[PDB]
Every structure is written in C-alpha cells, then in structure tokens.
Amino acid sequence: LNESVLKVNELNKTLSKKSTELTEKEKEARSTLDKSKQKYSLLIRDVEAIKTEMSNVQANLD
Amino acid sequence: SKQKYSLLIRDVEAIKTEMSNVQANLD
Fold this sequence. Notes:
The structure is cut from a larger assembly and holds 2 copies of chain A.
Chain A: H1 2-34, H2 37-61
Helix pairs in contact in A: 1-2
C-alpha cells in the first residue's frame, strides 16, 4: 500500500510536466500562425500527443 | 480557425497511421 501511494504521488509530477509542455507547445503554435503549415501541423499533432499521455495518467491515478 | 485546423491535422495523421498499418500487413 505504501508503494502504491508513492507511485500515484509520482504520477502527479508527469501529469504536471505534460500540462507544462502542452502550454508551451500551444504558445509556439500560436506564434507560428501569427507569422507555416508544416510547423503548425507538427506542433498541433504534438499538443494532441501530450493530451493522450495525460488521459492515461489520469485513468491510472483514478 | 485554430480548432478546425487542429482537428483536421490530427485526423490526417490518424489516416496516415492507418495507412502504415495496411502497408505493413500487405508487405
């Protein structure tokens, strides 16, 4: 039980990191539009690739 | 424009992923 508590407490830092990286990538994407198709597309695939990683972590935590 | 573009590019990549699976199976 102690190890499981530690494991969830550590999954929270990855949820936090992918929140951060998603925010950063979204800012980059908006910068791309302001200035293009391929960089914007790649950042958007990523932005979604990170949210998928987030949902897995949320299910595991639950 | 942001949301429609995003949904369409994810869908395009999804389709390309489906394509690569079919190509490996065919090979």
